[PDB]
Amino acid sequence: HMLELPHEKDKPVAEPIPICSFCLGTKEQNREKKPEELISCADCGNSGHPSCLKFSPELTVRVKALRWQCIECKTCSSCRDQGKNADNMLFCDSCDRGFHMECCDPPLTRMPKGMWICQICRP
């Protein structure tokens, strides 16, 4: 029972690039030369092995069910921008959506220290 955002719906999906941006191999060979299906950006088509993206199996499953943005394409799920502090945009460890600290509810001013999950994923 994973929640999808209205603005993530009915949007164009770029043609997936069948190669990992990190290890430069296909779904048939990850870094260990083992099979691993790719995760692909719906904006630009950029793909990566979950292993290359350092995704946990749990995060991998949830991301595959969502409209995912690659590391470069990721916009704030609140304000829909990258902005001045795009490098500091938080990534949810549950769904990998992006959130500026000031766009979080409630707002943050300092970086959380361990695992962080967004307002959408928080119980």
């Binding site: 941006s21 430069l24 350092k54 590391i71 795009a86 490098d87 460890d93």
Partner: peptide, 15 residues
């Protein structure tokens, strides 16, 4: 932490 900047560092850059 885990931000966009750290994601770049952690995975080794994109191509």
């Amino acid at each position: 932490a885990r931000t966009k900047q750290t994601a770049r560092k952690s995975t080794g850059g994109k191509a």
